[PDB]
Amino acid sequence: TPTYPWRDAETGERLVCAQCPPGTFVQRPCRRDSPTTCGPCPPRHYTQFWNYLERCRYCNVLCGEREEEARACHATHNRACRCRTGFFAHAGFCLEHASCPPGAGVIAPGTPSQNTQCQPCPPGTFSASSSSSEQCQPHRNCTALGLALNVPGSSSHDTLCT
Amino acid sequence: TPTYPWRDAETGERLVCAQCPPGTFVQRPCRRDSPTTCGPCPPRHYTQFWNYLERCRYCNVLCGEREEEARACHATHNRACRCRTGFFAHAGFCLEHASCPPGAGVIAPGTPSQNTQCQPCPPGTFSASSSSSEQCQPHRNCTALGLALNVPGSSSHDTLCTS
Amino acid sequence: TPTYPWRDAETGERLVCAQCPPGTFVQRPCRRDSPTTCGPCPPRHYTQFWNYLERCRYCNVLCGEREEEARACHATHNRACRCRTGFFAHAGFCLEHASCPPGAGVIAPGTPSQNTQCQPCPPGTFSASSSSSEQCQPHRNCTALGLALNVPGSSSHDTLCTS
Amino acid sequence: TPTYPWRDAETGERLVCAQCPPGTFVQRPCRRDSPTTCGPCPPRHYTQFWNYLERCRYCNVLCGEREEEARACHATHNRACRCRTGFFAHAGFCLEHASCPPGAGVIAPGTPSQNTQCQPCPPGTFSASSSSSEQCQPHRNCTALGLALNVPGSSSHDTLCT
Amino acid sequence: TPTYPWRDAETGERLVCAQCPPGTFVQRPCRRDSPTTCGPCPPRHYTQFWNYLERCRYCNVLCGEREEEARACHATHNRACRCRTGFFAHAGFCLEHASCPPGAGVIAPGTPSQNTQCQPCPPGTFSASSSSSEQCQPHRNCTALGLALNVPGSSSHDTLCTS
Amino acid sequence: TPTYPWRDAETGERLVCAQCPPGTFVQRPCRRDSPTTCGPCPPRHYTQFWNYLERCRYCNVLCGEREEEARACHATHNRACRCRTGFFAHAGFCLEHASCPPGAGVIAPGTPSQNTQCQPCPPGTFSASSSSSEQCQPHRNCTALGLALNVPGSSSHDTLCT
Amino acid sequence: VNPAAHLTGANSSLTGSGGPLLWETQLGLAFLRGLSYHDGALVVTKAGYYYIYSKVQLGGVGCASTITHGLYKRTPRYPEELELLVSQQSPCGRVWWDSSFLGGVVHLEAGEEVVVRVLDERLVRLRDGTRSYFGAFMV
Amino acid sequence: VNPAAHLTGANSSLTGSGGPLLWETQLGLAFLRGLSYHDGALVVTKAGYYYIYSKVQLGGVGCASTITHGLYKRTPRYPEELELLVSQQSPCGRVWWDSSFLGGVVHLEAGEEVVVRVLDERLVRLRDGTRSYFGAFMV
Amino acid sequence: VNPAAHLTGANSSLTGSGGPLLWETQLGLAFLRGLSYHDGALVVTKAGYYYIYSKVQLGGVGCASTITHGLYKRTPRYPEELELLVSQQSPCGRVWWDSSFLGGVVHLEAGEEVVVRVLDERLVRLRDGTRSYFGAFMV
Amino acid sequence: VNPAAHLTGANSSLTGSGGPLLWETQLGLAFLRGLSYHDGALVVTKAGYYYIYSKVQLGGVGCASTITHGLYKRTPRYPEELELLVSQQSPCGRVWWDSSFLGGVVHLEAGEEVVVRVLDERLVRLRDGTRSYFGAFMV
Amino acid sequence: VNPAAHLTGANSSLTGSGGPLLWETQLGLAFLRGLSYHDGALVVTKAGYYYIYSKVQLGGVGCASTITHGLYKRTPRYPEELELLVSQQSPCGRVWWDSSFLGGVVHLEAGEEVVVRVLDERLVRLRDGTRSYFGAFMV
Amino acid sequence: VNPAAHLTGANSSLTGSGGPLLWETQLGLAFLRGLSYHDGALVVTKAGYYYIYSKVQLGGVGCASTITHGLYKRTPRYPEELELLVSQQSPCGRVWWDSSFLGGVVHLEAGEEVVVRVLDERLVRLRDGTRSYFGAFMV
Ligand SMILES: *[C@@H]1O[C@H](CO)[C@@H](O[C@@H]2O[C@H](CO)[C@@H](O[C@@H]3O[C@H](CO)[C@@H](O)[C@H](O[C@H]4O[C@H](CO)[C@@H](O)[C@H](O)[C@@H]4O)[C@@H]3O)[C@H](O)[C@H]2NC(C)=O)[C@H](O)[C@H]1NC(C)=O
Ligand SMILES: *[C@@H]1O[C@H](CO)[C@@H](O[C@@H]2O[C@H](CO)[C@@H](O[C@@H]3O[C@H](CO)[C@@H](O)[C@H](O[C@H]4O[C@H](CO)[C@@H](O)[C@H](O)[C@@H]4O)[C@@H]3O)[C@H](O)[C@H]2NC(C)=O)[C@H](O)[C@H]1NC(C)=O
Ligand SMILES: *[C@@H]1O[C@H](CO)[C@@H](O[C@@H]2O[C@H](CO)[C@@H](O[C@@H]3O[C@H](CO)[C@@H](O)[C@H](O[C@H]4O[C@H](CO)[C@@H](O)[C@H](O)[C@@H]4O)[C@@H]3O)[C@H](O)[C@H]2NC(C)=O)[C@H](O)[C@H]1NC(C)=O
Ligand SMILES: *[C@@H]1O[C@H](CO)[C@@H](O)[C@H](O)[C@H]1NC(C)=O
Ligand SMILES: *[C@@H]1O[C@H](CO)[C@@H](O)[C@H](O)[C@H]1NC(C)=O
Ligand SMILES: *[C@@H]1O[C@H](CO)[C@@H](O)[C@H](O)[C@H]1NC(C)=O
Ligand SMILES: [Cl-]
Ligand SMILES: [Cl-]
Ligand SMILES: [Cl-]
Ligand SMILES: [Cl-]
Ligand SMILES: [Cl-]
Ligand SMILES: [Cl-]
Ligand SMILES: [Mg+2]
Ligand SMILES: [Mg+2]
Ligand SMILES: [Mg+2]
Ligand SMILES: [Mg+2]
Ligand SMILES: [Mg+2]
Ligand SMILES: [Mg+2]
Structure with missing residues (x-):
């Protein structure tokens, strides 16, 4: 489990937090007593890698009329398109x-x-x-x-x- | 075995001569008492089918500086080229x-x-x-x-x- | 009525023959005692002017898939085409x-x-x-x-x- | 005569004003006692439709050297150009x-x-x-x-x- | 002086005739008892080298509306053109x-x-x-x-x- | 020697200062008692003309791989390039x-x-x-x-x- | 507090109706801060001078050949659109791509709107919200 | 009597079967003099050397943008055509027009034939019998 | 109070003299707020960093082939123009259109000026003040 | 003696009257052997079948960007030319150069003529008599 | 106090490594005010909405044919670049020039960075710091 | 026996010496009948008028983008070639293909020769002996 540094939200104390895995994002940073809280990506959003994002990335890929989905939006990856x-x-x-x-x-x-x-x-x-x-x-x-x-x-x- | 019509040259009887197979050509038409003489194609020439040519087709195909022989000139086919x-x-x-x-x-x-x-x-x-x-x-x-x-x-x- | 020079074929007298009008051609030159015989153009042929052709011009015009006849082949004109x-x-x-x-x-x-x-x-x-x-x-x-x-x-x- | 809604400039009271016709603009909004005051468009300006604009539109069309005016600037329309x-x-x-x-x-x-x-x-x-x-x-x-x-x-x- | 082979027309002796210089052409081949007769090129023709032509080359070069003569037609050269x-x-x-x-x-x-x-x-x-x-x-x-x-x-x- | 007008930095008095020659810039404006102070251009900078710039211009010209310097950066001119x-x-x-x-x-x-x-x-x-x-x-x-x-x-x- | 927005290309951006482009306003890179949106239009609530901008990514196969990309104001004071910033482009001069960008400062009252149009719209190529977009900020 | 012929473009010239072009043999400028015709082919009745020739008028709208225009021999001695004289043109490099002309001397025996093929045939534009044609004469 | 301007294409914009483009400053969409203008130039009165911008609409018939569109500073401290933001474009590669846009932040003192130039100017096509323009705002 | 001729490009070849090209008939490579000439036309003195041919060298600077190059018959029996062999080329598809060649067998009577026409004639570029020409021989 | 920067083309801008363009930050027209820089990236220290912009001057000889010019965010919260504003262009459709400009407002936290990339970078043509550049200001 | 020949494209045809093309004279379609050959040249053994002809198949990849294709006479009476029939083509106006055909009647004496030259020779594309060739016959 990789980690990231975080200076406590208002205590000031300078911490070492667990990152969140693919398919999740940082819902709540780590604190004195509590570990990082990782939530699952909402629909239409994703995280493909370990991360400390406070919002998942958006499945922003669009397929045109001559394309179809090679992969759908999923919690761990964006949509992709093919001919x-x-x-x-x-x-x-x-x-x-x-x-x-x-x-x-x-x-x-x-x-x-x-x-x-x-x-x-x-x-x-x-x-x-x-x-x-x-x-x-x-x-x-x-x-x-x-x-x-x-x-x-x-x-x-x-x-x-x- | 396909055939071609001929005439015996001494008498005039119609003849029904054998064609020659791939790799060969008619070197001598049939006679009343012997078959068609099929000769082998000489170097640089071919026949790909059964035929009654009196000379084989020339391997006329030329390959450029960016190409090479995909098939060589052979008795039964022309040369061919690829990149x-x-x-x-x-x-x-x-x-x-x-x-x-x-x-x-x-x-x-x-x-x-x-x-x-x-x-x-x-x-x-x-x-x-x-x-x-x-x-x-x-x-x-x-x-x-x-x-x-x-x-x-x-x-x-x-x-x-x-690191 | 325009004319063309000829020669009577029995005697040799010079003749002055009538040309033929649009829609016709000279089927028989004039003689000492009869006019030029103008024949009507056959199907698929025309003459647009006074003339002394011995055959009418062919309606040679072809219309493509995107065109149609603006004028048909007629005795006095070729076909023509438009979109x-x-x-x-x-x-x-x-x-x-x-x-x-x-x-x-x-x-x-x-x-x-x-x-x-x-x-x-x-x-x-x-x-x-x-x-x-x-x-x-x-x-x-x-x-x-x-x-x-x-x-x-x-x-x-x-x-x-x-509303 | 079409109308537009106007909340009084500083009384606060919420009104129903007459719009101004083509060739005019709103010089002064309607009030308690008084109807809308419509002024004529200044030169080089226009209004082609009923409106509650506080400035006429500008006759902004320009003809190049290979063009001439098909219509001039007028109080009710822009210039237009033709070859x-x-x-x-x-x-x-x-x-x-x-x-x-x-x-x-x-x-x-x-x-x-x-x-x-x-x-x-x-x-x-x-x-x-x-x-x-x-x-x-x-x-x-x-x-x-x-x-x-x-x-x-x-x-x-x-x-x-x- | 370069030469060309000929034959005397009366006898048949081989002859060794003089070629003709630039500006001229062979108007008459050599004979046993006289040299080659080199004639001058006529107007609008040239020979640029020693030669044994029987007519001079034509000054065939044409200059367009945007060009002019860089060299004129002369006995020893064709015309040429420049912008x-x-x-x-x-x-x-x-x-x-x-x-x-x-x-x-x-x-x-x-x-x-x-x-x-x-x-x-x-x-x-x-x-x-x-x-x-x-x-x-x-x-x-x-x-x-x-x-x-x-x-x-x-x-x-x-x-x-x-200012 | 050309001159430029300068309203004293904080005295307020409105002056007539000597400009600085090519290869120099205005290091210090002219004052009551003192003439303009002109400094030499730093390296990689220039002034090609008389001027009252407070910073020399930068020798900003770049030669591509198919070019060489026709002239180098100098205190009085920019680099220039040729094929x-x-x-x-x-x-x-x-x-x-x-x-x-x-x-x-x-x-x-x-x-x-x-x-x-x-x-x-x-x-x-x-x-x-x-x-x-x-x-x-x-x-x-x-x-x-x-x-x-x-x-x-x-x-x-x-x-x-x- | 200083009005700003950036709206992005979305699977609904190309209506095919002759009206303005529509846009995404909340997801991914899109946002609204002190501005609103309605059927394609940025809607002004605080009157002032705004730098407005749009980009549209064009592309096609061979060559109608002239494309217009513009920003237009709608005000309820006048019954048609007013052109603000416009570009004409002929990129098809056999796949091709071209991008058109516009920016400029305009005065906008409370209640007025700005839209983007392209003719012919069929040449706009959506990929991911980064290649066509529309935004503004008060200046 | 020296063998000669000139066959002209006609209504039926483009079969679309992938076989040779067909030609008018009797009307207008078309003729046969000591040569015969069968299904598009000049049929040889007197053995010797012939200058054969063909022109095809090509044309189209924009851009297998390479056209092959060829003359080919058929002999009953061998089950495949032999190419004689061939051109490759890529003329579509809006409306375009191009003509391809070929001629040369070949040896032909009695009973052999010569045909003309254009690939793709759809780019031949027939008008009046003067712009596409096929002929020969003994030399 | 925050300096801003947008100047538009006008029937006088193309002087043909080799100098800068001129512009409209009061009518239609044009305006000046805390900036001035003089013979084509925006004139700064409050020193600071400004995002400056210009667009020019180019067009022509066939193809000199290279167009420069730039923003240049004039200061009285130096006797020639200083290039700020520049584009080179070859749109003529038979009617064509192309638009060129430039934007960037530059430092400007009180008394300095910014102008727009295009070479060759004859390719600028005026229509209505929305397709070529020039503006700025303090940042 | 078999009729033959080859007429070459010359100073006067391009009349601009809309009539046929004219040609050199005696100097350099030009000649007449059992055929005559009158005002651009090969004049036939012995009836039979002739292979007629013409080449014209075309060239220009950029781009009626279709050129017609044709051979035409005149007979005193009919008041209009008859087209024999015709090519359409659009070679301007900067400097360009193109050659158009035509040949074929036609039947000609004594007293008939053959001429060459190029429309537009202004695209024929004469040089030396080798690049544009008109000839024939009996077959 | 309001963050702003303009970074310019420099002799080191084109690394050839596939990474971002580098830029000049202090000399000539370049500057940083309340923003930092590191290996090509503008580094944000005050969180907020920024109008970011870049221009790159492209040019070449004949025609790989498609160029991408984009602005990308790096955040330490995620191990790859996030696309923000991107353009695709095919200018090579025999010297040519084309300029690509991008602008847009994006949200940036303290510690995040923005970079510019072009593929293929070899088509960027540096001259003097005015034709390719990269900047931002808080909005 | 009427003199005739047809020489075909061959392995050695392109010398690159700047001298004439060489040709196959015996195999396949090539032949000589009352004409001889020496180092690329048709050698004349019976004086008279000959229709000479040549085709060369040209082709390349993009764009001295003018090709000269010519027939030239050599006589031992004069130390320089004489041009007879010449074409200029600029076919590169990606892959392209073009054919250049020439023919005409010239007078030739015994001991004279005719050669073919293409400049630049590197654009001749040999395949099978059907697409480039040189021939003649007495008329
Ligand atoms: C660095 O290394 C770690 C490993 O130590 C690695 O983390 C892995 O990330 C991948 C890719 O995002 C994860 O794989 C996914 O896992 C879930 C199940 O847990 C699957 O459902 C995922 O979806 C697949 O299924 C789809 C069907 O709808 C398919 O279309 C498609 O094939 C999808 O990929 C997917 O497999 C994985 O969970 C982690 N592993 C761990 C232990 O965390 C990480 O990606 C690496 N980082 C970098 C920058 O490369
Ligand atoms: C909705 O309907 C109303 C009708 O109930 C309609 O209002 C009309 O607008 C038109 C067009 O702008 C007006 O027509 C103009 O009127 C004046 C005279 O009053 C004329 O001088 C105008 O100029 C013409 O003359 C020029 C000569 O210099 C010509 O070059 C040119 O032909 C000009 O048009 C012009 O005719 C009209 O006054 C009103 N009518 C009323 C009763 O208000 C309105 O346009 C419609 N709205 C929409 C959105 O279509
Ligand atoms: C207006 O007039 C004045 C004259 O009254 C004029 O000022 C001159 O400017 C020039 C050009 O910038 C100056 O010339 C330079 O002087 C120094 C020596 O003092 C030289 O070293 C310079 O460098 C040259 O050498 C390089 C070698 O590294 C070469 O590559 C190149 O040839 C360089 O130019 C250069 O000669 C000159 O000093 C002044 N003169 C005075 C008296 O001030 C000014 O330019 C004019 N203004 C305008 C707008 O035209
Ligand atoms: C056709 O068939 C025969 C007999 O089976 C065979 O010998 C011959 O090679 C065949 N031809 C080809 C081209 O395969
Ligand atoms: C020429 O005139 C005559 C006599 O008036 C007429 O019969 C003929 O048809 C005319 N030709 C044409 C083409 O109109
Ligand atoms: C070749 O040399 C001779 C003798 O010196 C001379 O007369 C002749 O003109 C020369 N030819 C050329 C082309 O210079
Ligand atoms: Cl997008
Ligand atoms: Cl036809
Ligand atoms: Cl405008
Ligand atoms: Cl010529
Ligand atoms: Cl630069
Ligand atoms: Cl070949
Ligand atoms: Mg419509
Ligand atoms: Mg197939
Ligand atoms: Mg000049
Ligand atoms: Mg006319
Ligand atoms: Mg790679
Ligand atoms: Mg050389």
């Missing part, structure tokens, strides 16, 4: 996850902290649409289906077999 | 992995495909440096050390305790 | 009619050729909405209603009176 | 009216609140100069002048007849 | 010499190759004008005139003394 | 001297106040590198070395002779 589904964090904003155009495919889905990752579809694969989920898929393989080649494919269109 | 260490791919370039400034820390290191991911150090943690590896680290905890608080820390500077 | 409702022309595009923010009101609605015109609401008027139709409207007039002022208005919020 | 001839209003500035280049013509003149409107000159018409007034004009019609065609015209040059 | 007075060269344009605002003064006037150079007026000097010639000038010195200070000056306004 | 070698002054910053690319050459070196000046290398000259010093140099002249022409040069490469 909602479909958005990623960039310079304090929640931006929409990008989609990979035709000719390119998703190599990693967007998350709260990262945009869609994309790549040009390598040889033998394709993606025909703008999409934030769809990957590069291998071309239809004519020989393995025992068909003949009708139209060669490309990075943005499937190979056609008769 | 070297310290760079990530964006819009056909290899750009330098960003550094998280003071006040922020790496939550995912950079890769060939991804830039450094950063966040602002949450309460009770810090990062004093612009760095591309350093994470938000917890504040020196004075009460845990039994030492008095000297100077409270922040998102960008550690807490200082007395 | 649909809610859009105006700028630099060969059809852009969305702007909205006047709160504090401002429409003084001219948007047209195919013109964007929304806006002004800041002058004193004694307001507009609370970002809108592409709403004009600055006069404040509720408490003295005219015989009611006490509750909250004075502004350029972006109406005056409130008690 | 001078040859300028239009855009985001609080007076900008020069644009001109339509060669190949395009004016479909609406600039005004205080709107820029020049232009269009590409449609088929059969032309404009050869950059101008903020000149419209698309029909090509010289060779046949109607009984002349033959010398040089075909374009959206930016007149047709020539011999 | 007129009041302009300097940047990225193949001739741009207007900047003006130093109030608070700053010209430390080097503009040239064809250089923009106006400016600095902020150092203490005890001023410049009240946006100008492309005016330098920072020393403040009127009240003590030197035996007059009282009225209003202290600044970087952009002279000091004022009483 | 270090290799940088030129532009809108209050010290920028790196630019280099002239291949095909162009330096016509004036950078200075503290001016960027590198460059020109396209005129006919008969060349520069093969990006450099902030190298000028357009005349092509190697084959005829003057009694050699024959191997490869014609260009604005960015020297002429080759066998």
